[PDB]
Amino acid sequence: SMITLQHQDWERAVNMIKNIPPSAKNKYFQTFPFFLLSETSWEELLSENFFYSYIKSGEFLTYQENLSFYDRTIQKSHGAYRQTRIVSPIIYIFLIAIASQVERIYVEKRTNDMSVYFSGSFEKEKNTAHYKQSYNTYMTELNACQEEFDYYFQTDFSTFFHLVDTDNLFNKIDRLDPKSALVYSSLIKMIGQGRMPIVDGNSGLSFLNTVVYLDDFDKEIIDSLKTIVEIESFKLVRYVDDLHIFIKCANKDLDFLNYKVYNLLCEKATKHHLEINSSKTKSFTPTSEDFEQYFSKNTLIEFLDKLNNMSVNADFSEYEKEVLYTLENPEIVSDGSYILNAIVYNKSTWSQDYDIKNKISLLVNSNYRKLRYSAKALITLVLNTRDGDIIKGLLNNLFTTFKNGTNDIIDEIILIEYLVQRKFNHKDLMTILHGIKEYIKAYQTSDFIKSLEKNKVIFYTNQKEVYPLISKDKILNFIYFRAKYFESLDLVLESFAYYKNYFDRFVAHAMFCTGIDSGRKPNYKLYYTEGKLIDGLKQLNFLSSDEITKIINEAHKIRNSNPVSFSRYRVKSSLNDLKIIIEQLSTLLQNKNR
Amino acid sequence: SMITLQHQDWERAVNMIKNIPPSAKNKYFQTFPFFLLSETSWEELLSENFFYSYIKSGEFLTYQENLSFYDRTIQKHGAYRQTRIVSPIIYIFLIAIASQVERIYVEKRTNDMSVYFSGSFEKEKNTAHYKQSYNTYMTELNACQEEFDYYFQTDFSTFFHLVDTDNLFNKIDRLDPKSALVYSSLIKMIGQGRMPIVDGNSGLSFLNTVVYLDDFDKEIIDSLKTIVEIESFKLVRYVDDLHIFIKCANKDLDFLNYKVYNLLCEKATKHHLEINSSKTKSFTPTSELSDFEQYFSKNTLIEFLDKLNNMSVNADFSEYEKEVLYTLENPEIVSDGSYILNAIVYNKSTWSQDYDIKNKISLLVNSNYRKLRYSAKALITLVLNTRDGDIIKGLLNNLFTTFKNGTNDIIDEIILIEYLVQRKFNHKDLMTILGIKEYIKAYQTSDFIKSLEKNKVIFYTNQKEVYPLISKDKILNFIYFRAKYFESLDLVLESFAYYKNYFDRFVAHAMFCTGIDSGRKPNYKLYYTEGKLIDGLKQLNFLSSDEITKIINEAHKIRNSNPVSEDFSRYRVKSSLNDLKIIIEQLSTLLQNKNRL
DNA sequence: AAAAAAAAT
DNA sequence: AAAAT
Ligand SMILES: [Mg+2]
């Protein structure tokens, strides 16, 4: 009733993550907690008992573990900062479940003149939350368009996710229930502190931003391209924000087509609040544009030498020009980054050469900061040496900088990349363990389904019987979620209005628990007035009658002046008073004795 | 008081706009309305009665003229800046918001830094134009050149569109949360949910530069002081543009470039700022910072118009800048042809009247006027500098042909609006040409203060007297403003809940106004429920008695299931809001009828 | 050199 | 298994 999500969507979401090969779940930070999941813990996820009582009831949006998010900076391919947000494993499923419901009820506007792919696939019998299957199919079609058509146009959007209007995204889904779209958009915006976050690899946000949000824009490009008579045929292929425009035309019309198509892209992008990446956009280009023999171990030695002699103050431009180009073989068709990844993932024994392992040791001990140019590949290169003195040396060099206080964001990314590749080893964690450190201790060492059932609160009535009405309340769970949603954005007016409703209803629940109100269902409406609140709270024998009248009278003075239904400090002070009462009214209920 | 804005803040906002020179007022779209304002209209804007009865009461947020915003694309490297055109009253309010913030905000940055924005709040130099601050900014850049050794330039990409308006107003500690709600929601209403770009507005320029960037700017100041290789440093800022002047030894330049640049990238990411990489240059020596007919002549302009006419319209901005704009450059002066072209159209107006020059300009506007899109503002001035009727009217006729044929695109709109602004909205051109055009008719043609009072709704009671309680209702006005704010964002649940509250209070006023309800104040509380609300609408005898029952029944059905107060879709909610809106239109029309019943 | 103004954002 | 946005 509150979330229109069906169990089939949550099931689909859980199945896409489970379908990821176990040898792939533990290569990423965000998918590692699912790698530690037992088979019995999986069965609980797809079980409808866990869905209707914890997911659909909104109970999961009432625990601080599911409303807490963390910052994590990852490295861009060419040396930029991609700021991401880390969410709890439960929230990671919910984002995919939302996309599962949207895929069922959204009617696409783009025609079959264009193929679309994202970091996932809802294709039947091939559901997966990973990018390999979709990206491989994406690159296979780019080759098909490479042979069929003559020229291609490539465009891209800058800061795509951060410029997405989350409210506008959910508004273009007609058959989406507005009461449910309010819950979805609030959670997503809460992850991004008001804007569309970057949950790296999350197919939920990938599908929503590529298939739904870009639908209107892609449709106008398709329709306008048909009016151009100079184009014989065309085909569009898109991966998230990357777009390829293959066409068939005469060479004599290439100039006018470049003028027509580029102005068509700019006009429509500005129309839909999209910013075209001028750097990553090229004009109409012709479609044409033993491994130990192409790249030997000597070519790898020159890489470490040019890198070990390069100063640590060199930017990415100096690293990519000298060091990375050393790997490119004239006869081979690959960049310096692609060849480097092929060595660490296939020629793993090369790091055990006497010369290579020694040149590697010089890198880690001289300055580990040189690892920042390719953190994933270079750390794998270090770990491929299989030498404990080097592996423990890189960790201790990181530990010394974190011990002093000079640890910036570069020391962080190297540390997190190191801890993920070593599978969050217990000995490494005992030496390191703030912010992201809390998520590592919380979900990266245990089964979060087993820890979910242990840390569950339980209320006991006067007859020492379990009270299950609070957690199953589809009104209390969502009013509390909205009160926390506005609190994270520091919007104290709307946050007080919602929490005051949660306060009156939770008080009405503690009455049915102690047997004071002995009706069919709890009397929620009775405690909306001031006279019934301070009288019932005093009847609970858990607070002083002088303080109770001091808090609710002040809180009533705020509700009668709240323009949502007096400084931020005054509102936050009365809200903190309402929270302390709840924390004591809660601890009073779990005590079966008296 | 639903906004804590003071009269001094509004007075300041109107003064800095008035302080703009007239010959600069008539140069921009947003400020041209004020160029037509009579002196009595200026007196009214500063008058105490106008502020308390129209601004601080929220009455201005209940007229469609102040809640209607239109898109407009201005020219950048040949990119698109999507702007949002606001009403003249709204243009002042954003500036008045900045005035209250300037009085109560405490800057965290120190005097190691100099911050400028598009305007000024200086004691004796209040101005809403950018020429004053930009000249002071250019002067400080020259002083910093003569004293420091190297400078580091930085810039933010999509700076305005990446700002979080809610977080911005949250760094203003002394701003009350209730006024911050109105200020934030109105700004987000203009930008359709995000921070907009109102062309040249000092109010948004001040907030995003002085307040939003404060946390980032102080972090750089504190971190630069810890670098022992930096002897001294001074920081200069203009909106998002930033210069880091330092004094140091040449031997530490490599370490300082790596230290300063990475610190910039780290803290910018921390505050959700996207650093522009194309405009960020490393530590460059200060010496590299940027009689007329002796260098540039009429022949230089003849060579410019020649290559422009030989270049095909299919050419892009790079081919224009490299092949055409280069002919204006001189190998003795460091200057882009853009700055040279601006000097010719603005200081050599008579050059466009030369015989040879005027013929190639006519050839430029008769072959394909879409070649003007490369330098829309400058090349239009070049055409208007010819003072030729057949040439200037020829450009208007070609634009009218592409608009009558229905084949006009965004490029033709940019040339058309810039042409209409540069020709000062000529009467003959307006009759030939005519959403953005509606703003032209409503504001760019006459005194908008005089038109404001001639189009004010007047409500008559049953005794044929004026009913003045609706306009002065601070509660009704702001509730209506929130309903139209959520409606603009297409958020049906919040828009219905606020409009229903506005609907209940408006009917309560119509009940007192028509004499059905007696006493001192209208009985607002009695019309909050289904039953009494239907009876009051039946009593007025202006709608079908059955349709009132169906509309209110469905309206209260939606209210009882609204989670912000299933089977309720977006369409169903929007239909009930429309029926509620339709009833108000009939109720309002009936109220401005003196001799009725 | 002046529709003492446009050109920066 | 990693190497994509
Ligand atoms: Mg609300």
Residue numbers in the entry:
A (entry chain B): 0 to 288, 308 to 451, 456 to 587, 599 to 627
B (entry chain A): 0 to 75, 77 to 290, 308 to 451, 457 to 587, 597 to 628
What does the paper say about this structure?
AbiA, AbiK and Abi-P2 are abortive infection system (Abi) RTs that mediate defense against bacteriophages. What sets Abi RTs apart from other RT enzymes is their ability to synthesize long DNA products of random sequences in a template- and primer-independent manner. Here, we report the crystal structure of Lactococcus AbiA polymerase in complex with a single-stranded polymerization product. AbiA comprises three domains: an RT-like domain, a helical domain that is typical for Abi polymerases, and a higher eukaryotes and prokaryotes nucleotide-binding (HEPN) domain that is common for many antiviral proteins.
In the crystallization trials, we initially used AbiA without a tag. This protein did not crystallize, so we used His6-SUMO-AbiA fusion protein, which readily produced crystals under a broad range of conditions. We obtained AbiA crystals that diffracted X-rays to 2.8 Å resolution. In the crystal of AbiA, the asymmetric unit contains four molecules of the protein–DNA complex, forming a dimer of dimers. The main interaction interfaces within the AbiA dimer are formed between long helices from HEPN domains (residues 510–540 and 565–585) of each protomer. The RT-like domain in AbiA contains palm and fingers subdomains that are found in all RTs but lacks the thumb subdomain that is present in canonical RT structures. Similar to AbiK and Abi-P2 (25), the expected position of the thumb subdomain in AbiA is occupied by the N-terminal portion of the helical domain. In the crystal structure of AbiA, short (5–9 nt) single strands of DNA could be observed for each of the four protein chains. Therefore, in our structure, we built DNAs with arbitrarily chosen sequences. Tyr130, Tyr134 and Tyr363 interact with the DNA strand through stacking interactions between aromatic rings of the side chains and nucleobases. Another residue that is involved in DNA contacts is Tyr27, which interacts with the phosphate backbone.
